C-alpha cells in the first residue's frame with residue numbers, strides 16, 4: 016500500500032491525485048483521498064480500482080481544502096476487494112482520519128481491547144480501522160481544547176506501546192493538523208518533504224516513496240525515523256518527536272527487491288543502485304558456481320529484473336537480450352458458458368520473442384520466486400520458444416516465510432521454497448538449473464548504499480521476525496480473514 | 508490504429524478482446540468489435556476508451572459468433588476522438604463490415620464519387636467508411652448469389668484501382684466470410700496466422716502485428732503480401748489472390764522506429780533487432796562525429812529508447828544508467844472553478860533520478876523528435892537534476908514532413924524540424940548538443956534484417972510520398988479537417 020499526506024497553503028486535491036498516480040505501483044486495488052474543507056469537515060472519496068478510475072470531475076469538486084491524505088491499496092488478508100478501502104475516520108474525539116501502510120500483528124487483541132474498554136466498534140477487518148481507533152481513544156484522554164503538540168505525541172507514544180508490527184501512517188485531526196509516524200523498527204517506508212511558496216509559507220508533505228515528492232516539486236527533507244512522529248499544524252508549523260523507546264532501523268528488504276520504484280531513495284538507499292548491485296552479486300555467484308555450463312544469453316523477466324540481469328550479463332560477459340515483453344494492458348477474462356479454447360494464463364502476462372530463444376541455452380533472471388506455478392510456466396514458455404537449456408536465477412533469496420508487516424504474501428505452505436531444497440524446487444518448476452541470491456549477499460548489496468543500516472527486516476527469508484510476536488495462532492487468524500475475504504468476493 | 512480478424516470454428520469474442528489488448532499500443536482512443544452470429548447478423552460494440560473499458564460482460568455476451576473483427580483507434584484527421592469509431596457496417600449489399608489501419612489520400616474525391624454515382628451517403632469523415640462504401644459499391648455489381656471467391660477478389664481489385672493511400676484491411680461479408688488485404692505498396696502492417704483444431708478444421712486470423720497471433724497461440728503463417736487479398740469462407744477455406752498491378756514492398760519505417768512492439772516481425776524483420784541495429788548506427792555515428800565530447804553517461808528516455816541506448820553506450824564504451832523512469836499510470840487534469848491551471852508537465856509522464864545526473868555530462872537518447880516540446884522539458888529536467896552538459900541523440904532522423912498513411916502526426920507547422928537546421932533545433936530545445944540518425948543509416952539498420960526490402964516508406968523524413976498524389980493543396984485539406992476535428996472534441 017502507499018500513503019500520501021499534504022499540508023499546504025492551497026487546494027491539495029490534484030497534488031494528492033498526482034502523488035497517488037506515481038505511488039500507484041504500491042497497490043491498484045483501491046484508492047482514497049480525504050481532505051478538510053474550509054468548514055473543518057472531512058471530504059472523502061474512496062472506491063475500488065485505479066486512481067484514474069476512482070476520481071472523476073464531480074469527485075474532485077467536493078474534495079475541497081488545503082490539507083488531505085490519500086491511499087492506494089494492495090489486496091490482503093482482512094482487506095479484500097470487497098472490504099471498505101482507506102482512509103477511515105471517526106468523528107470523535109474532534110474528528111480523526113487515517114491511512115496506513117503496514118500490518119498490526121496484534122490486531123485481534125486490539126479489536127477486543129477496544130470493545131471491552133472503549134466500547135469502540137470496528138466495522139471492518141482492516142487493521143487500519145483498529146489503529147485509527149486506538150489512536151482516537153488515546154486522544155480521548157485529553158479533556159481540554161485545543162490540544163498541544165505534546166498531547167498528540169503522548170497519544171502517538173501510547174499507541175506505539177499498544178500496537179505491534181510494521182506501520183507508516185499519516186492522519187489528520189480537525190482543528191489541529193496532520194500527523195505522520197513510523198513504527199519503532201522503521202520497517203515501512205515514510206519520507207518528509209517541503210515546498211516554500213514565499214516568505215514564511217511552506218507546504219509539507221509525507222509519502223511512502225520519494226518519487227511522490229519529486230513529481231510534485233517538493234524538496235526532500237529526509238526519511239521519518241523509526242518511532243518518530245511528525246506533526247504539522249494548520250498554521251504550517253512542523254514539530255517532531257521520538258515517540259518510541261528503542262527505535263531501530265530494520266527497513267523492509269522487499270521494498271528494495273521489487274515493491275518500490277527504482278528512482279526512490281529509501282533510508283538514504285537508492286532502489287535503482289541497490290538493484291544493480293544485486294545483479295553484481297548474483298552475477299559473481301553464478302560465475303563462481305555455474306562455471307562449466309554454457310549459457311548463450313541472459314534474459315530478464317519483466318519488469319524489475321531488467322537492470323539486474325543486465326548487470327549479470329555484464330559480469331558473465333554474455334549478451335543480454337529482451338526475450339520477454341510484458342503485456343502492459345491486461346484485460347478481464349469473462350466467464351462465458353463454454354470458453355472453448357482459452358488463452359494461456361502466462362501469455363496473458365508475457366509474450367516471448369521466438370527469435371531470442373531458438374537453439375539457445377538461456378538464463379532467465381527474475382526478482383523472486385513465490386508460488387512457482389508462474390515460474391514453471393515461464394520456463395515452459397521458453398522451451399516452447401525453442402530454448403534448449405533453460406536456467407533460472409532469482410535476485411531474491413528463497414522466500415520461505417510469509418510477510419506480516421505490509422507485503423501481501425501467500426501462506427507458508429503455498430511458498431514453494433518453504434521446506435524445500437534448491438534442487439527440488441528446480442525439479443518442480445522444470446528448470447534445467449536454478450540458483451538463488453544468498454541472503455547476506457543481498458544485504459551487503461543494499462547495505463553498500465548506506466552502511467549505517469545494520470539490520471534489515473528479512474523474515475520472509477530467515478523466519479526471524481523483528482517484532483517477535485508472530486505465531487501460528489496469529490498466522491491462522493490471518494487465514495480466517497483471507498477466507499472471509501474470499502467468500503465476500505465470491506458472493507459479489 | 509490496429510486491426511484483428513478471426514475466422515474460427517468456435518466463439519471468438521474473448522479471443523478478439525485478447526488480441527486487441529496486445530495491440531492496444533496501436534490505439535487507445537476507441538475500440539470496437541463486430542461478430543456474425545448464428546443467425547447471420549452483425550453483433551457490434553464500439554465506444555471510446557481502452558479495450559478493457561469498452562467491453563463489459565453484458566457486451567461480450569451479445570457478441571456471439573465464430574467469426575469477427577476488432578479495431579483499436581488512434582485519433583487522426585477525420586477520425587477525431589469525438590468521431591464514430593470502427594468498425595463500420597453497411598446493410599447492403601449482403602451486409603459488409605470493415606475495419607482498417609491506414610489512410611486514403613484521395614478520400615475527398617472518392618466521397619464525391621460515391622454520392623454522385625451511387626447516392627451512397629457517408630455519415631462520418633472517417634476514410635474507413637469511404638473504403639467500406641467503395642468496396643460495397645464494387646460488390647453490388649454481382650447478380651448471382653452467393654459470391655464466388657472470384658467476384659470478391661475482382662471487387663477488391665476494382666477497389667484497389669480507385670483508392671489511393673496506405674491500408675491494411677479486414678472485412679466480413681455475411682453469408683460468405685472474412686477478407687483481408689494490404690495496400691499495393693505494403694505500407695501498413697498485416698500478418699496471417701493459423702490454429703489447427705483437428706484433422707478437418709483450422710481457424711485463421713489476421714492482425715496488424717504478429718504479437719496478436721503469438722498470444723492466442725496461432726502459428727505465424729506469413730505477412731499478407733502488398734496488393735494481396737485473403738478470403739476465408741464460412742466453411743474454413745482460405746483463398747489468396749494478388750489484387751493489384753505492380754505491387755511493391757515499401758514497409759512503413761515508423762513502425763520499426765516507434766509504433767510497433769519489439770516482439771513483432773513485420774515483413775520478416777524483428778522490430779527488436781531493427782531497434783538494436785539503430786543503436787549501433789547511431790552509436791557509431793556519435794563515436795565518429797562527437798569524438799571530442801565529454802560524455803559521462805548514456806541515459807535513455809523510456810521506453811522505446813532503452814535497448815537502443817544500451818547499444819550506443821556499448822559502442823561509446825560509456826556507462827548506461829536509468830536516469831528516467833516512465834510513470835506507467837497517468838491521470839487527467841481537472842477543470843475546477845477558481846483553481847490555477849498548471850497544465851504543462853512531462854513530469855506527470857516521467858520522473859528523473861537526481862543522483863544519476865549530478866555534475867555529469869549526460870547523453871540523453873530518445874527515439875524521435877516531433878514538436879520538441881517534450882524534449883525541451885526533458886532536457887530542462889536533466890538540468891534541474893544537476894546535469895552539467897545535456898546532449899541529445901535521436902534514434903530517428905528529422906521528422907520534417909507530415910504522415911498521410913495512417914500514422915498520426917501534427918501538421919508540418921507544429922513539426923520543429925520542419926524548416927530548420929539541427930543547430931537551430933538544438934537552440935530551441937536548449938540542448939548542448941543534438942544529433943540525429945542519418946536516414947540512409949536507419950535504412951541499413953532495418954534492411955539488414957531483411958535485405959530483400961528495397962525501399963521503405965520514409966515520407967516523414969524525406970517528403971517523398973510513394974503514392975505521388977500529395978501536395979500543398981491536399982496538405983491544406985488535411986488541416987481544414989484537423990480544424991473540424993478540434994471543434995468536435997472541444998465541443999465534447
Ligand SMILES: Nc1ncnc2c1ncn2[C@@H]1O[C@H](COP(=O)(O)O)[C@@H](O)[C@H]1O
Pocket residue numbers: 765808811873874875876877878879880881882915916
Ligand atoms: N506521432 C507520435 N505521436 C505521439 N508520440 C510520438 C509520436 N512520435 C513519437 N512520439 C513520442 O513522443 C516523443 C516526441 O514528441 P514531441 O516532443 O512532441 O516531439 C518521443 O519520445 C516518442 O516517445
